[PDB]
Design a protein around this ligand. Structure first.
Ligand SMILES: NC(=O)c1ccc[n+]([C@@H]2O[C@H](COP(=O)([O-])OP(=O)(O)OC[C@H]3O[C@@H](n4cnc5c(N)ncnc54)[C@H](O)[C@@H]3O)[C@@H](O)[C@H]2O)c1
Ligand SMILES: NC(=O)c1ccc[n+]([C@@H]2O[C@H](COP(=O)([O-])OP(=O)(O)OC[C@H]3O[C@@H](n4cnc5c(N)ncnc54)[C@H](O)[C@@H]3O)[C@@H](O)[C@H]2O)c1
Ligand SMILES: NC(=O)c1ccc[n+]([C@@H]2O[C@H](COP(=O)([O-])OP(=O)(O)OC[C@H]3O[C@@H](n4cnc5c(N)ncnc54)[C@H](O)[C@@H]3O)[C@@H](O)[C@H]2O)c1
Ligand SMILES: NC(=O)c1ccc[n+]([C@@H]2O[C@H](COP(=O)([O-])OP(=O)(O)OC[C@H]3O[C@@H](n4cnc5c(N)ncnc54)[C@H](O)[C@@H]3O)[C@@H](O)[C@H]2O)c1
Ligand SMILES: [Zn+2]
Ligand SMILES: [Zn+2]
Ligand SMILES: [Zn+2]
Ligand SMILES: [Zn+2]
Ligand SMILES: [Zn+2]
Ligand SMILES: [Zn+2]
Ligand SMILES: [Zn+2]
Ligand SMILES: [Zn+2]
Lengths: 345, 345, 345, 345
């Protein structure tokens, strides 16, 4: 009845399979999927041992989703069949203190209630159709290209969230360091330019990726190696960086972040790569804050899409078919994706 | 001993005159003036009746000052002879709650203590030399061109201050309206682009000035006439503008601001033009805030200069000599200055 | 089938009448009403000429509602029959930028969509039963006394909102002025003590009401008369008040607010009493902001109720029956209610 | 010429000694010391090995200072002989971006320029007289008791700073945990009550100290032991604490802080006790921030003193003479000081 990309066996690769076409229950909506982004978080999930994997098998992947509204569940109002929409991913209960400010990413009853994001417990977007639990998890696209913008649902939303949180500690004329210019990173750079006055130093491990970072707005680019810290120190007059966004989050990138963050600065550990930053006296500088944020808010998604509309941010897309999804994931693990891999089913 | 531009007779024009070269008292510094901006606030001061004028005669004009440090007063440390510096203008006591956060513009003991800005009570910058009361009112220029950047001391500082105050009410994807694209206005536009994601609508009364506004970053430009409000309504989907910066502040521009500010929006009345905005229920929308800010903070000046360094903002300058200062002021009143008039003595 | 208090004829008084007991449509919930507060906003609505009145006749009054969940509409989840809940009143669309941060009070599509608060267009709480449009407009009471706390839905929520907005301009050791110690006012005073370090000056026109204000936390109380401004000036060392909350909002109380707000201060015009504050240069001080807020946010309601739980705030209640509702409204207009009139049907 | 308490030999105890009475150089002021607080930071400094100790020998101790102005240095204005003043301790350059907002605690040129706080490099307050570098490091006392309030210069200032930084993450009705109810801790508790709506859970290791914490405003007190985490979990409905202030900062107290901080919460590591908090994914919860703040700002000091004036905070003082300073330090290390040890010379 419909085609989809699923994780089905622990330690195995994602596979294109045929599954039932779902029907919207009451409250729910079905989208005909127009675009679906691939995220390195998916590689992280599939790289988990059986004892640590909690999302059930099979799992349709894909938590960056956009589409056209296909069918309405019982009692649904707010959207009409035919509306083009992006999917807000980090679902929450809707009612707690956090959910009420739109910050369903920090919902305090989601684990207890078994609420799970699409592609991370609930059925994802890498399919011809998908279900969304509730109308508040849908944002209008207007006449934004779904393929061009779908990744703003995470590749944009997540670093935007990290940046907005950090703005107090990034005055104009301060310096922001971005470690990793990939899916999130290449959007992170653009977002720092759009809404701060900060000088942006990007880092990565291919010249080719550094060149894209330069073009996307990075004032300075640097290889992520042993020299990085000292060059960043030189670039900031020895003061260090007011803000550091680590989009890798390995021990070594975190170590780098610790050596270059300024007095009173902030480190957002965005990338999930196995490290921790030892925060405390004589480890991190005085006044320096460290945080590992997760995804972002409903308002923030809308805001990121509005930046797309205004031409202030865009995704560098590498386009694929549904059948190529496995192939594309292999490319992503190998580091041969330029920007974001996006599937059009 | 030195040449200067002064206001000497009520209702009269500024004149080039010869005066004593001042010597720095203890705490004070003398600058050899490298650049001096002209502001429409000066026209406002000289247009005051005798009973309302409080700055004493004669008065050397010019509150946008930059220079090279010429001589040190007794006990001065912090600066060296030869340092290039911008002058922070809205002087305060240094010690009250406001002064301590750097916001000497909102100093609560300045009037009581007779503290007055250079060119607005104290001797100004339109001269070959000038005195600054204290070292904390000097900011380093580095290798910024004094002539290009001097006006960032007010033409930049003032609207930057207004914008920073308003950022909470300007999410990315909201709309900011700028009424008046003159000295402050043409910098205001650039600053909104540098540090917000907001769509900028500029307004003015010459096509020529609107064209410069477009080039400087305004997404949309509009003649400031009877149609303005409805076009702004159309441009925002009928919601109105999240923020309005009125750099004219006449009753009519204020009236315009009131008709277009959105629910929960903000109006910064920056221009001094004789009006007031009737703020209250069924006059201003629910949640809408109105403010008449003054100048800006010490940190904000530094921040604006750092934006100049990073190429994010600049002043469109029209250059003059000291002898042409009167001529230049006539031009400013007539509306035939492109950006900012700057004198080099 | 059920008893209710309605406004039925323009210029007439509210009447106890018998109406149909409503049934919950899909999405909706019915409450058995445990308490219903009376607000002076209701007097304002009933005092409107026919051409300005937009809520339709008849209208069941009462926008401060609490209850026990009586029946669930089709497809409703989140609440169970038997749950004790407060009603969040300033309803919005749920989906716009403002609604998504919980600030349905500043919803930008409510007027267009005909969305109306209970007791202010939709059927209110002064009845044995009431309908709520959606589950997100219900907050749990836990084991808070509905009668004691119901007025926190507006009498608390509204000034809390005004205070939270103003906190940046109320450092500890600054002074907050509260003009009017009535339903909102007597809670406003308590809230300023709970969550700021500000010295509180309350004002009113009866000694008896001033005495309650003193007891509820006001550091200083003053008759609202010609001497008020100078006493407030003396009390602040001539600086003025960092924040002023006018809970009357008549021209004279607004005039008072203008004369006493400090440089860089803020005025929240909370009371609806026909005035406007002329905001602008030489009318309001430099940096002073003026705002007419409306109600508050979803998070703020929860926060106010949590303060009640912690014993940090309470409502001084004057208790009535449904039959006494008209009588109680007469008392409120005459100024002989101590704190808040609350009806228990 | 004058008596003072100094650290003179590595690993040795502080001694009362006779030294020259200092004279104010230009810019400087001499205080006749009216009170001098003892801080556990001093124990930390004296417990340092020779290779890690950087403050030179001898060193007059005492960084909580208050006094009466005794003599003016050359060119000093702002203060008069006879003015009662508290000493702002975390000195900075005065001119950098941080210093300009008053945050000399986060000055980015202090280490480079050898600027050192009184009692932590510069000569301290535990003496009959002391020198202050500049007038901006003095705050007026008014008619506050120097002995009662002197410790607000650090015991108050430091946690106030930590709390103010955390307020965004402490809505009213959230929970704040304070680990350690000593000099800073017992003020921290009061400050959380004064300026937030948060429920306060204090912890310590003596019943006697816990009892004082209860009296000073702690809603709940708990022994700092193996049960602490679970009781805190029970007390917050399993959500955890929105904010945790660790005033011990040992590995075990930091471990406790990590287990109880909520999703989106914040940990301020205030105490210097040798630990670090491993901040990062699956170590700290999503959105949780960790920071090790240092001292506070100029505005914050003023604000804390203004809270004292208003009766909102006070120091529980244990009074000593200069000769008893060594004895008092022994007591502090042994944990037999109730609140703050204060010396009156
Ligand atoms: N916190 C969140 O909510 C959240 C959300 C989405 C993704 N993520 C995480 O963010 C990280 C990045 O995701 P993505 O989709 O952008 O990955 P990606 O594969 O698109 O990009 C990774 C980039 O990191 C670069 N890189 C690798 N090692 C590096 C090093 N030592 N120094 C500098 N650069 C280095 C690569 O060259 C590449 O450009 C992942 O760990 C992912 O799980 C986190
Ligand atoms: N608040 C403060 O602290 C502060 C500081 C500096 C200047 N100002 C004030 O700001 C205002 C502008 O100063 P400036 O130096 O930029 O003046 P300017 O002469 O450089 O520019 C004025 C601009 O306003 C435009 N204008 C005039 N009427 C208009 C209308 N009805 N609609 C749209 N545009 C209109 C003109 O065409 C011109 O471009 C003045 O009133 C000045 O006194 C205030
Ligand atoms: N902005 C909003 O969203 C919102 C919400 C609710 C109520 N309100 C408005 O707030 C105002 C107060 O409502 P309430 O229910 O507390 O009224 P109330 O009748 O309970 O209290 C009014 C109080 O104001 C006092 N007062 C009257 N004139 C005064 C003066 N000149 N100076 C000082 N005190 C004076 C009275 O003595 C009384 O104590 C009303 O205008 C109401 O419509 C606004
Ligand atoms: N970050 C800063 O800028 C700054 C400033 C001043 C002081 N400090 C540091 O703050 C800490 C406290 O200073 P103080 O003067 O208040 O010390 P103090 O001696 O006055 O108080 C210490 C308190 O901690 C309690 N305590 C010890 N171990 C504990 C545990 N495991 N659990 C709970 N409570 C415990 C003690 O019983 C005592 O009440 C020190 O480490 C000091 O160096 C930091
Ligand atoms: Zn992802
Ligand atoms: Zn939730
Ligand atoms: Zn000016
Ligand atoms: Zn001042
Ligand atoms: Zn009301
Ligand atoms: Zn809405
Ligand atoms: Zn200390
Ligand atoms: Zn500094």
């Amino acid at each position: 009845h419909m085609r989809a990309v699923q994780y089905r066996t622990i330690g195995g690769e994602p596979e294109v399979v045929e599954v039932p076409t779902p029907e919207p229950g009451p409250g729910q909506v079905r989208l005909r999927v127009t675009a679906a982004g691939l995220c390195h978080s998916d590689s992280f999930v599939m790289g988990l041992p059986a004892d640590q994997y909690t999302y059930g098998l099979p799992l349709t992947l894909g938590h960056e989703g956009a589409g056209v509204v296909d069918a309405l569940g019982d009692g649904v109002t707010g959207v009409s069949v035919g509306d083009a929409v992006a999917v807000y991913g980090p679902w929450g209960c809707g009612q707690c203190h956090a959910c009420a400010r739109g910050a369903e990413n920090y919902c305090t009853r989601a684990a207890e209630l078994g609420i799970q994001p699409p592609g991370l417990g609930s059925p994802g977007a890498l399919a011809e159709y998908m279900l969304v639990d509730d109308v508040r998890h849908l944002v209008p696209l207007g006449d934004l290209d779904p393929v061009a913008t779908v990744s703003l649902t995470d590749a944009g939303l997540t670093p935007y969230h990290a940046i907005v949180s950090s703005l107090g500690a990034l005055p104009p004329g301060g310096t922001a360091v971005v470690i990793g210019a990939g899916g999130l990173g290449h959007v992170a750079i653009q977002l720092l330019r759009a809404i701060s006055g900060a000088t942006v130093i990007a880092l990565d491990i291919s010249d080719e990726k550094l060149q894209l970072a330069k073009e996307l707005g990075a004032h300075h680019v640097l290889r992520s190696d042993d020299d990085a810290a000292a060059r960043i120190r030189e670039l900031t007059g020895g003061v260090g960086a007011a803000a550091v966004f680590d989009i890798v989050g390995a021990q070594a990138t975190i170590d780098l972040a610790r050596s270059v963050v300024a007095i009173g600065g902030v480190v957002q550990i965005v990338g999930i790569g196995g490290g921790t930053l030892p925060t405390g006296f004589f480890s991190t500088p005085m006044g320096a804050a460290v945080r590992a944020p997760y995804w972002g808010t409903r308002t923030e998604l809308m805001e990121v899409l509005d930046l797309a509309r205004a031409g202030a941010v865009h995704v560098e897309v590498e386009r694929f078919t549904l059948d190529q999804a496995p192939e594309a994931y292999r490319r992503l693990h190998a580091g041969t994706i330029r920007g974001r891999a996006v599937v059009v089913p």
